[PDB]
Design an enzyme around this catalytic site. Structure first.
Site, PDB file in Angstrom:
ATOM      1  N   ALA A  49       0.721  -1.347  -0.152  1.00 48.12           N
ATOM      2  CA  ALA A  49       0.116  -0.152  -0.060  1.00 48.12           C
ATOM      3  C   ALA A  49       0.761   1.314  -0.088  1.00 48.12           C
ATOM      4  O   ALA A  49       0.547   2.487  -0.599  1.00 48.12           O
ATOM      5  CB  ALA A  49      -0.878  -0.066   1.264  1.00 48.12           C
ATOM      6  N   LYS A  50       2.068   1.270   0.465  1.00 51.64           N
ATOM      7  CA  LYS A  50       2.965   2.324   0.654  1.00 51.64           C
ATOM      8  C   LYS A  50       3.280   2.889  -0.837  1.00 51.64           C
ATOM      9  O   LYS A  50       3.786   4.225  -1.003  1.00 51.64           O
ATOM     10  CB  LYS A  50       4.307   2.017   1.355  1.00 51.64           C
ATOM     11  CG  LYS A  50       3.918   1.729   2.769  1.00 51.64           C
ATOM     12  CD  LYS A  50       3.254   2.841   3.413  1.00 51.64           C
ATOM     13  CE  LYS A  50       2.864   2.612   4.828  1.00 51.64           C
ATOM     14  NZ  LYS A  50       2.887   4.211   5.737  1.00 51.64           N
TER      15      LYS A  50
END
Lengths: 333, 333
Positions: A49-50
């Site tokens: 998700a980063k």
């Protein structure tokens, strides 16, 4: 020839970020009430998700003229944010400098270096304001480095802002039917950005966070006080924190729950063996939290529950997917 | 609520296989003639092109009634095919048994076991017909095991058949403009299935394979004779072979070229640092082969070149992305 995005043809790796799959689960959630869906953020090109955070903050800095080939991106990270920033830095020709703590396995450090990042290893069990910490090492490096930015994900409002789009995806993919979202909270950017979008479409959506044992987040969520008794070393990376990040918006989060390092590790292993989903440590925590929330009665037959799976199992070969490491922690015999 | 595939909502992990991105490259291919595109098979849920093989062969066996919960899937694999079969076996409730050779790093063995597969480690440097080899270990296990199948990817015609769809994707994603495809050949299923689709749409498309030093494939392609002088141990996994697989269709392949273990490893590292694409050993081989083909004059300003990137860098942390391993092979100082 031209480049079509529904043919899945792309001119830039940055377009391989976002719009991740939502997958219905039937086996790991057997016998729970309602329907359960996993938001698979490991499908981002950077495998977490980063990627969304890194893209959003880099593009913002580029729009502001702050980055050109040769500029330097500095960040404090336990692995995933640094990877995504180093991936983008390699593509763009930026120098990337990551302060990481030795709580992270050496696997993550070598991934960062494969992308060409300069890595500063820091002692894990020091206070955040200790000049040896990976928070303070990165701030120093930024101050000493001209033509540099400091991403500072724990206190950067662009972090939860980047996850507004994650919430939009979840909203559209459940066709507005979502009733609960379960998200591990590290910086808190993911849960907060998701919560901002979902609560604006339907304030009845329950936003449920997951915390570690040894982290101040849950207690702060309930008392708005930082309690040092709540803070002590633990083994899950990327969930909970030894300070209060302003990236966490505690007012949109309905509840927090803690999961033990052991149960999260066992649940990650069970998820792989049951669903064939080979996911990271916090995905194990997230699914374990769904089990704990379900036993507490949060869900019924009409629940539409989305659980965010933040990253991929391939980054945990020296931890939860190493039988030796699990034996050494006492998580298995 | 209902499940929409353009919302990227899915009822089964098996739908997260195929329709992978095609990404134009500008930096690693700087100064070559034409346009270059990477087909990113690491975006399959199982992180390699072998997801397509496993899905196609499992679904075929299911349609034929040969697999039900409790049945056993046996296969010989150096890692990726076994992973994809174990991933599907975990989801479906099949017992998965993989014979792997100790040429593969222990990382791949532990991934297989995380998915619940039973792994038989075999000595690498034995003849294919030596009963100790991973080819023969798997055939024995199949014969001893009732309610089992033996995938046998090296001699299974369903293997190249599964990659007909890969060629269809490449054809549509380049809008029929592709002039060359560069594909590493292991079993040969990927290059052959791709070649079958592309040559049927346009026989002028050049199908270019990549071989290892120590593999019989290139010589067989040119002479149709198996030359044991061509076969000796080498370090790249998943390219070349010590036998002639019938999964390889040598009549649709226009040319083969060999790349050294060293250049492939250096090129994988350079690809990560230049494009931010963190890809496997054979992707390094594939890009190195594009460089070698380009210097030989294969491409001009009108070329539309697709290079297949078969799997992800995260499976090579103990090899090409380990500075210690690279020093030990003499690939870096």
């Amino acid at each position: 020839m031209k480049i079509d995005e529904s043919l899945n043809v792309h001119s830039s790796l940055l377009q391989l970020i976002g719009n991740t799959p939502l997958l219905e689960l039937h086996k790991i959630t057997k016998g729970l009430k309602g329907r359960y869906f996993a938001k698979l953020e490991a499908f981002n090109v950077g495998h977490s998700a980063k990627d969304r955070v890194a893209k959003y903050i880099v593009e913002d800095a580029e729009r502001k003229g702050l980055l050109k080939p040769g500029s330097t991106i500095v960040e404090t990270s336990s692995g995933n944010t640094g990877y995504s920033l180093a991936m983008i830095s390699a593509l763009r020709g930026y120098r990337c400098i990551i302060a990481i703590s030795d709580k992270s396995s050496h696997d993550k450090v070598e991934m960062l270096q494969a992308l060409g990042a300069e890595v500063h290893l820091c002692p894990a069990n020091v206070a955040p304001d200790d000049p040896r910490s990976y928070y303070e090492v990165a701030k120093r490096i930024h101050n000493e480095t001209p033509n540099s930015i400091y991403v500072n994900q724990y206190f950067n409002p662009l972090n939860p802002e980047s996850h507004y789009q994650t919430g939009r995806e979840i909203w559209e993919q459940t066709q507005g039917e979502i009733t609960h979202v379960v998200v591990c909270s590290g910086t808190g950017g993911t849960i907060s950005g998701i919560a901002h979008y979902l609560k604006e479409q339907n304030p009845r959506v329950q936003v449920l966070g997951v915390d570690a044992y040894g982290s101040a987040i849950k207690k702060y969520h309930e008392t708005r006080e930082f309690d040092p008794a709540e803070v002590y070393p633990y083994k899950i990376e990327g969930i909970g924190k030894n300070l209060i990040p302003t990236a966490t918006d505690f007012d949109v989060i309905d509840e927090f729950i803690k999961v033990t390092d052991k149960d999260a590790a066992l649940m990650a292993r069970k998820l792989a063996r049951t669903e064939g989903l080979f996911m990271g440590y916090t995905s194990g925590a997230a699914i374990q939290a769904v089990k704990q929330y379900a036993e507490a009665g949060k869900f019924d037959e009409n629940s539409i529950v989305v659980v965010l799976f933040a990253d991929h199992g391939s980054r945990y070969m020296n931890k939860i997917y190493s039988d030796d490491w699990m034996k050494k922690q006492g998580f298995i015999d």
